[PDB]
Design goal:
The structure is cut from a larger assembly and holds chains A, B, C, D, E and F. By secondary structure, chain B is mostly helical. Chain B has five helices and no strands. The chains are: A mainly beta, B mainly alpha, C mainly alpha, D mainly alpha, E mainly alpha, F mainly alpha. Chain D: This is Photosystem I reaction center subunit III.
Chain lengths: 80, 169, 739, 160, 41, 168
């Protein structure tokens, strides 16, 4: 399964979570930004690696980073 | 609407107000997209060069210098007979003059950048004509008109020499 | 306040000309990177994203059509003007079989005047392969003054179409209901446009082209031929050549149409003097076409209680296997410009290819069959246009599926049922493509390896294992027997390609029976295989344009997008555009093979010279039958052999063809930089270049960015197509002009 | 002489090339009639070929064993009109182009909408800058001295 | 003629005019002094 | 309604009364989609050009300038004058005048106040008040239209039959 990391540059704009096609990211409470929220990656087993999450990231060099790793039938997007 | 004094069916052009040759002649509006100070500097320099060149024609066909090289009554053919060496010296001397008279600032963007430069005013007046300000404006207008007439005449003489080949006479 | 048009919808102003990108909501803010410049041209004609109203899109399309027709009219006017002023048309008229058509002279600069060839007739210029001279001769044009007047009329028509476009966008723009009158539009395009154009052309042929060309074939010089208007004012100048005009129009109105058999014939074959189709046959053909199309135009109900409703016809065509059938197709084709473009472009390209075939098969112009450069150029050009238009039709079908397809409005209809079993279609098409490719190409490779191993009896040749195209030979036999048996009123077969005698004009073969052997079997199956693979790519693009097992929401990404990401193992090129890109590549492959087959087969087994005793000697000598069955044969006896004229063209009047050969090679190789590389490398190189510019304080305000992934692919495919087609263009033209 | 080459005025193969080209042109000329424009064009071709060959012969041009002018670009002023003078001419013209482009970029870079003035050129300012490029060698060695030609550390750098 | 002159000031029109003028004077130099392999001086 | 010239056609709706030579003649409605000042300027330019052209054609078929080049009929004078460069000078000066005209018509269309065809050229007066100016404008328009039609007829007849000044 791929690896997804969140960095404290998160501004809690939720654009990553609402762009994930496989429900990998979610918004959790935080105290490091104005919005009081930070993205989390608790379901990386469903991560497919499409990187839509970091295409919607407005922070300078990203706050969500996807590191491709071992492959799985879920991560390979295999309907068969 | 005011309408121009020279071209009476055209609106009065802008940017020519405080000048010494203003008759409202700018149908193409060259003073709108080109600096008027640069335009007057260029007009004065072209006029002065044309006057000197017309006088040069008339003297060359008449007087000439001793020597085999300087023996062509036709100015156009004299440009070729004289060779490149005398002409290149004139080119370099004119360049030296251009550099020293404008004191470095020679380009359209560099000249008049700081202002304080009346267009065409090199301060050249050794004989003292122009101390009286009353006749100064008349002298400026006369210089402008003579320069324009000499531009037209310099073109005329050069093209007469090209279509006939002998001289001006 | 008309019910069809809106008056003064858009003001004629230059203000928006000074605001580039005003049409787009995203581009209107102004450029920030160089990507804006490329996006400006990529969205210029995408009227769907510029307005949210179908009416505005339709009006823009209508005015764009007017602009295109004005451009076409200007091009035709230029062609006629060049024929009038910079051509040897008058000299070619008096010697069609010995003067090469030229209509473009080259200025004497930088030594380029060598391009002015010895085309004959006391003329120097570039030989013309567009066949305009033959077309003008078939039109009865016998003077360059007529060409000048046609050019003037073309200029006037081009201005008229420009004015029409301006008028119908800015002064009186039609409403949506006017555009959606598909019944009225079909009625008019079928009766008025097609039928009345055929009728008017039949009238022109009968009254101008029939007498003038008959006099020309009789040997009358163009100067003593009467002016065309005299054939109308004087019923005696045409009644001598065709002694049936003496009865006037009475036989027509008295149903005694047999009297007009003098100039309305049904002969078939070719004119023995000119080598083209009998112009009496052509006039009769256009008359019949006019009547048929006028009749066909009275089909759809427009404004009276008479005719058909296309909605009622489609909705009644259901079936046990097709559910709701064609229900909803009328709404699809009356609310989506992209669906109409798909159908029209596909059928238009297919029509262009059919035209290309029927052109050389039955030469319709005088002295065009013996002008081999003209025939080769016309066939290749029309087949290329057809392939491009077919790929465009597939592209716009995919665009309709992505954008204008409504799932609710198409419940259980044909479109829905096709998407529901797209897997089966694509899998079986995949199997068919593999079967056809394996067989055709592996038979080619088997022939090559048997020849390389010294086993000549193991090939798939005529003197070996033979694959006779018996079905095509049966059809050829049926056509050569048609006159008198199935077409009893025919005097000759439709084309001598099916069989018959060798038709030669001035010792040059015009048409001749095209024998089909094992070599034609293999190349025909190659054609079928390439066409099937192109169809596979395009149909996979259209069907999987909305969703798939990989990306269940591919429609939300649009028609044109590079990917969905490196995930799922990699989701490159999943768009539908990336399928029109690959399909463009495969169309290039297929059309290149088709034109190669045509060129080699014609040069080897049709074209040539006929000896006075009747011995036929061809351009190459019949090497197609035995050497077109191996890839080494194609490489050596066709490519290497016929490329001799291109490479040896330097210093001659064909040197421009060698230069274009080299330049097209250069462009084709240039394409591979964009096709093989990726955007990240070029962006990071531009980073260092920008560093240098910033170091020298010359970095542009518009930030330079590498071309987008989709634009990189588009540039690559455009350069690839240009280079390959130009290389084949120069090769074909130099080879067929030299010999 | 230089590199084993010989002057084209004494190169037999050069004259053979001239004679062959003229003969081909005359043979082409034979197949046309009277003072017709094709014959005039071919005669002009012959005249231009002869003039070009004569000018190349009397041009201090060195010809090889193929009878074609070879360029001596080692730097010697003897053959200075082959490379050195065209080199100076191009350097002047290209420096002019680069200088006017850089000046325009830096001038509209200090306005409210720098990017707008790059797709829609300020033709007055563009004309003002373009005709000022004749002093580009002097302007360059007056801006480099003042430190206005080179940026120092405001330039961006990647992570490593 | 205020926005038309601004349209003529756009990058494509200006580049086309400048390149047409450039090719023009190059072609005319090569017409009046053809076959110039070296510097005329 | 019911324009003066064509009594059964409606008034062109752009020519009420406030133009010299306005009899309401625009059946095909050219004024409905083109500026009135532009059309007036074009008409007056045509009037003046054709008046000069008719007078010149008729006179040059009678009186010739000294020289062998000027010894041709006006019908064949175009190909001779263009070869001698005589028409080149006219083209140059007419182009200068027409560029100044480009400026003038642009200014007139964008405000200004210059009447169509009004170049203020009036060395003599010939027009002292508004009434005289209107009458002379009407005379100029009528004479110009007559001369345009007359030059049309002269050229067509001379081309049809290569006759001298009587082109019958
Ligand atoms: C739309 C199609 C088309 C095409 C491809 C051409 C192409 C050409 N025309 Mg042409 N022409 C066309 C339409 C076309 N014309 C029309 C509609 C007319 C009627 C007005 C003409 C009238 C015409 C004349 C009278 C001449 C040409 C010439 C030329 C050639 C040189 C053009 C040139 O250098 O101009 C450069 C243009 C510019 C720099 C303007 C920017 C070139 C092959 C010339 C030629 O062949 O010389 C021997 C020539 O003398 N054309
Ligand atoms: C008999 C009547 C008639 C005729 C001849 C045409 C002919 C044409 N139509 Mg058309 N049309 C008609 C009725 C007709 N239409 C009706 C009733 C409707 C309403 C449903 C439409 C709606 C329509 C649309 C929406 C479009 C066309 C287009 C076209 C053109 C197709 C391009 C082509 O084949 O090039 C052949 C070209 C020629 C043969 C050139 C000569 C044709 C000239 C222009 C005659 C045109 C006839 C015109 C209708 C007369 C009106 C004159 C006006 C003063 C009223 C062609 C010119 C398409 C096009 O190209 O747009 C411009 C297009 O997009 N038509
Ligand atoms: C009747 C024909 C027709 C029409 C009306 C359209 C219309 C359209 N197409 Mg389309 N298309 C067509 C044929 C047609 N196409 C064909 C035949 C193909 C197959 C190649 C395609 C493939 C295609 C794709 C793949 C796409 C479109 C798109 C579009 C839309 C936007 C077009 C645009 O902005 O381009 C503006 C015009 C340009 C950018 C011009 C580019 C220059 C070309 C590529 C090079 C031409 C070179 C030329 C031959 C000269 C080379 C000579 C050399 C020596 C210089 C528009 C609705 C796009 C879209 O989004 O649709 C909604 C899109 O993605 N089309
Ligand atoms: C010469 C190069 C080449 C070759 C051989 C192929 C071959 C093929 N392409 Mg293509 N393709 C090419 C270049 C080529 N392409 C390029 C440059 C592009 C870029 C645009 C594409 C883009 C492209 C697309 C987009 C598609 C194809 C498809 C296909 C397949 C069609 C089905 C078929 O015939 O399979 C049969 C295989 C052959 C004919 C190859 C030769 C096989 C020999 C003759 C017979 C078997 C030999 C035997 C097994 C050897 C065993 C011994 C060995 C173990 C030592 C086929 C594999 C389609 C596909 O997937 O297939 C349906 C498809 O959709 N291609
Ligand atoms: C834009 C650049 C440019 C420049 C600087 C010139 C410069 C010149 N041209 Mg010219 N010309 C140009 C473009 C240009 N031309 C173009 C694009 C065409 C159309 C293809 C022509 C067609 C042309 C003709 C037909 C003639 C000139 C002539 C001339 C010369 C006298 C005027 C002069 C050297 C004249 C000349 O010197 O010939 C004797 C002449 O007769 N030109
Ligand atoms: C990039 C390398 C390169 C170089 C160095 C040259 C250099 C040359 N080429 Mg050439 N050429 C090239 C690429 C190159 N070309 C390419 C890629 C092609 C294919 C399109 C050609 C096609 C070509 C042809 C067809 C011809 C040349 C000719 C020439 C020569 C005359 C140049 C000229 O007109 O000067 C005169 C013009 C100038 C000096 C312009 C500058 C003048 C300005 C206005 C001065 C103002 C400031 C003071 C020259 C030696 C011509 C020749 O005679 O060859 C010997 C010739 O006929 N070339
Ligand atoms: C539309 C205007 C026009 C044009 C195009 C021509 C053209 C021509 N005329 Mg002509 N002519 C004109 C008006 C015109 N004329 C008028 C109004 C008269 C009466 C005075 C004449 C009297 C005339 C004679 C007597 C002869 C010609 C001849 C000729 C031919 C060669 C010499 C020449 O240019 O004329 C030279 C013209 C003149 C000597 C008199 C012109 C007087 C002008 C038109 C009146 C003042 C108008 C003013 C200058 C406008 C300013 C223009 C503005 C842009 C600055 C040439 C075809 C000669 C020829 O070859 O005959 C076949 C010849 O012998 N013309
Ligand atoms: C060819 C077979 C054919 O077209 O028969 C026609 C067959 C009959 O379908 P329908 O009777 O339902 O069609 C009635 C209406 O839809 C008219 O189109 O269509 C199919 O079943 C499609 C299956 C294609 C299977 C490909 C093999
Ligand atoms: C005289 C002239 C202009 C004169 C104006 C003058 C003096 C007045 C100027 C001033 O009042 C103003 C305006 C304003 C004041 O503040 C300044 C002054 C100075 C007081 C232009 C001539 C302009 C002269 C021109 C344009 C001449 C063009 C000639 C051509 C084209 C000849 C071509 C041929 O000779 C060839 C080439 C080959 C031959 O075989 C064929 C032909 C055709 C004959
Ligand atoms: C055309 C021209 C002037 C045209 C003026 C016009 C139309 C004026 C019209 C007006 O005034 C009137 C009529 C009335 C006014 O109220 C209104 C306007 C409208 C203002 C000048 C040309 C002027 C032309 C000039 C000055 C040309 C000079 C050429 C020189 C010096 C050439 C030198 C060489 O040719 C040699 C000698 C040897 C070569 O081998 C090398 C070089 C170096 C190239
Ligand atoms: C080189 C290259 C670039 C860089 C290319 C750029 C930045 C294009 C630059 C184009 C210039 C700026 C304008 C065109 C200049 C040409 C001389 C004009 C065309 C020639 C005419 C005759 C048409 C990419 O961005 C890219 C992206 C994706 C895959 C491959 C590649 C790729 O290979
Ligand atoms: S960039 Fe190239 S590779 Fe990476 S995802 Fe987009 S398409 Fe697939």
């Amino acid at each position: 399964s791929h690896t997804v990391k969140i960095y404290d540059t998160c501004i809690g704009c939720t654009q990553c979570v609402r762009a994930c096609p496989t429900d990998v990211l979610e918004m959790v409470p935080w105290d490091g930004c104005k919005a009081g929220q930070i993205a989390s990656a608790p379901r990386t087993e469903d991560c497919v690696g499409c990187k839509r999450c970091e295409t919607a990231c407005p922070t300078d060099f990203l706050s969500v980073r996807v590191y491709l790793g071992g492959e799985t039938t879920r991560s390979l997007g295999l309907a068969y | 609407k005011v309408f121009s004094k020279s071209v009476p069916f055209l609106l009065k052009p802008a940017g020519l107000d405080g000048m010494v040759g203003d008759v409202g002649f700018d149908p193409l509006g060259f003073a709108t997209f080109i600096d008027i100070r640069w335009l007057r500097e260029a007009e004065l320099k072209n006029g002065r060069v044309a006057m000197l060149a017309f006088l040069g024609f008339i003297v060359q066909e008449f007087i000439r210098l001793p020597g085999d090289l300087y023996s062509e009554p036709n100015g156009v053919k004299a440009f070729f007979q004289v060779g490149p060496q005398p002409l290149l010296q004139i080119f370099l001397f004119c360049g030296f003059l251009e550099f020293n008279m404008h004191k470095g600032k020679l380009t359209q963007v560099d000249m008049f950048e700081d202002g304080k430069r009346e267009p065409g005013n090199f301060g050249f007046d050794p004989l003292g004509f122009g101390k009286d300000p009353a006749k100064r404006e008349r002298y400026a207008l006369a210089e402008l008109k003579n320069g324009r007439l000499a531009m037209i005449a310099i073109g005329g003489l050069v093209h007469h020499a090209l279509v006939t080949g002998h001289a001006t006479f | 306040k008309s019910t069809i048009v809106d008056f003064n919808p858009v003001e004629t102003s230059f203000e928006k000309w000074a605001k580039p990108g005003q049409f787009s909501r995203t581009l209107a803010k102004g450029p920030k990177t160089t990507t804006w410049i490329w996006n400006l041209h990529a969205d210029a004609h995408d009227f769907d994203i510029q307005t949210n109203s179908l009416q505005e899109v339709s009006r823009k399309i209508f005015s764009a059509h007017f602009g295109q027709l004005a451009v076409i009219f200007l091009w035709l006017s230029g062609m006629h003007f060049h024929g009038a002023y910079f051509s040897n048309y008058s000299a070619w008229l008096t010697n069609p079989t010995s003067t090469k058509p030229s209509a473009q002279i080259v200025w004497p600069i930088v030594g380029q005047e060598v391009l002015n060839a010895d085309v004959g007739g006391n003329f120097q210029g570039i030989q013309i392969t567009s066949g305009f001279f033959q077309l003008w001769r078939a039109e009865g044009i016998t003077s360059e003054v007529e060409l000048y007047w046609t050019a003037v009329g073309g200029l006037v028509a081009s201005f008229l179409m420009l004015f029409a476009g301006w008028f119908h966008y800015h002064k009186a723009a039609p409403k949506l209901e006017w555009f959606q009158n598909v019944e009225s539009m079909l009625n008019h395009h079928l009766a008025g446009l097609l039928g009345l154009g055929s009728l008017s052309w039949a009238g022109h042929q009968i009254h101008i082209a029939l007498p003038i060309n008959k006099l020309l074939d009789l040997g009358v010089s163009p100067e003593e031929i009467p002016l065309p208007y005299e054939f109308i004012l004087n019923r005696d100048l045409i009644a001598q050549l065709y002694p049936s005009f003496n009865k006037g129009l009475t036989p027509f109105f008295t149903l005694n149409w047999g009297e007009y058999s003098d100039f309305l014939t049904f002969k078939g074959g070719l004119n023995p003097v000119t080598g083209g189709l009998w112009l009496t046959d052509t006039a009769h053909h256009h008359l019949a076409i006019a009547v048929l199309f006028i009749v066909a135009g009275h089909m759809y109900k427009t404004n009276w209680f008479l005719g058909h409703s296309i909605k009622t016809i489609l909705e009644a065509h259901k079936g046990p296997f097709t559910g709701e059938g064609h229900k909803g197709l009328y709404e699809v084709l009356t609310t989506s410009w992209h669906a109409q473009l798909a159908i029209n472009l596909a059928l238009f390209g297919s029509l262009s290819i059919i035209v290309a075939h029927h052109m050389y098969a039955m030469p319709p112009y005088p002295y065009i069959a013996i002008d081999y450069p003209t025939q080769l150029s016309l066939f290749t050009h029309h087949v290329w246009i057809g392939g491009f238009c077919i790929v465009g039709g597939a592209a716009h079908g995919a665009i309709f599926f992505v954008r204008d397809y409504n799932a609710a409005n198409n419940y259980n209809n044909l479109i829905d049922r096709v998407i529901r079993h797209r897997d089966a279609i694509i899998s079986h098409l995949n199997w068919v493509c593999i079967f056809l490719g394996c067989h055709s190409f592996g038979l080619y490779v088997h022939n090559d390896t048997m020849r390389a191993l010294g086993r000549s009896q193991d090939l798939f040749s005529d003197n070996a294992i033979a694959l006779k195209p018996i079905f095509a030979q049966f059809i050829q036999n049926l056509h050569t027997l048609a006159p008198g048996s199935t077409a009893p009123n025919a005097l000759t077969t439709v084309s001598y390609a099916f069989g018959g005698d060798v038709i030669s004009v001035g010792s040059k073969i015009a048409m001749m029976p095209i024998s089909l052997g094992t070599a034609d079997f293999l190349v025909h199956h190659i054609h079928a295989f390439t066409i099937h693979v192109t169809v596979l790519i395009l149909l996979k693009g259209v069907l999987y344009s909305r969703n798939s097992r990989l990306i269940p929401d591919k429609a939300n990404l649009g028609f044109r997008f590079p990917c969905d990401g490196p995930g799922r193992g990699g989701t490159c090129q999943v768009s539908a555009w990336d399928h029109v890109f690959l399909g463009l590549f495969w169309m290039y492959n297929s059309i290149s093979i088709v034109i190669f087959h045509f060129s080699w087969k014609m040069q080897s087994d049709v074209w040539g010279t006929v000896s006075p005793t009747g011995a036929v000697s061809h351009i190459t000598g019949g090497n197609f039958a035995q050497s077109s069955i191996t890839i080494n044969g194609w490489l050596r006896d066709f490519l290497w052999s016929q490329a001799a004229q291109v490479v040896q063209s330097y210093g001659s009047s064909l040197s421009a063809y060698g230069l274009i050969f080299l330049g097209a090679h250069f462009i084709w190789a240039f394409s591979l930089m964009f096709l093989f590389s990726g955007r990240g490398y070029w962006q990071e190189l531009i980073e260092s270049i920008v560093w240098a510019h910033n170091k020298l304080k010359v970095a542009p305000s518009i930030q330079p960015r590498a071309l987008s992934i989709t634009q990189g692919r588009a540039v690559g495919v455009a350069h690839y197509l240009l280079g390959g087609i130009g290389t084949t263009w120069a090769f074909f033209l130099a080879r067929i002009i030299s010999v | 002489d230089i590199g084993g080459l010989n002057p084209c005025k004494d190169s037999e193969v050069f004259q053979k090339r001239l004679a062959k080209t003229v003969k081909k042109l005359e043979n082409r000329l034979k197949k046309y009639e009277e003072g017709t424009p094709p014959q005039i064009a071919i005669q002009q071709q012959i005249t231009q070929t002869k003039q070009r060959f004569t000018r190349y012969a009397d041009s201090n041009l060195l010809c090889g064993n193929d009878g074609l002018p070879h360029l001596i670009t080692d730097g010697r002023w003897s053959h200075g009109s082959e490379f050195l003078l065209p080199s100076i001419l191009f350097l002047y013209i290209s420096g002019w182009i680069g200088w006017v482009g850089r000046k325009y970029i830096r001038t509209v870079g200090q306005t409210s909408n720098p990017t707008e003035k790059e797709i829609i050129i300020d033709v007055p300012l563009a004309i003002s800058i373009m005709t000022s490029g004749f002093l580009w060698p002097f302007a360059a060695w007056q801006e480099f001295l003042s430190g206005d030609l080179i940026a120092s550390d405001e330039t961006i750098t990647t992570s490593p | 003629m205020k926005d038309f002159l601004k349209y003529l000031s756009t990058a494509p029109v200006l580049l086309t005019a400048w390149l047409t003028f450039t090719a023009g004077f190059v072609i005319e130099i090569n017409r009046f002094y053809p076959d110039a392999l070296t510097f005329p001086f | 309604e019911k324009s003066k010239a064509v009594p059964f056609l409606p008034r062109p709706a752009a020519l009420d009364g406030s133009v010299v030579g306005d009899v309401g003649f625009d059946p095909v409605g050219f004024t409905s989609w083109l500026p009135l000042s532009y059309l007036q300027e074009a008409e007056i330019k045509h009037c003046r050009i054709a008046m000069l052209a008719t007078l010149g054609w008729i006179v040059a078929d009678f009186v010739h300038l000294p020289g062998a080049v000027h010894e041709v009929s006006s019908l064949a004078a175009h190909d001779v004058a263009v070869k001698s460069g005589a028409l080149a000078q006219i083209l140059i000066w007419t182009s200068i005048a027409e560029a100044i005209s480009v400026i003038a018509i642009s200014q007139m269309l964008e405000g200004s106040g210059r009447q169509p065809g009004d170049f203020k050229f009036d060395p003599l007066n010939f027009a002292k008040d508004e009434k005289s100016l209107k009458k002379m404008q009407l005379s100029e328009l009528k004479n110009g239209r007559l001369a345009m039609l007359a030059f049309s007829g002269i050229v067509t007849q001379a081309a049809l039959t290569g006759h001298a000044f009587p082109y019958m």
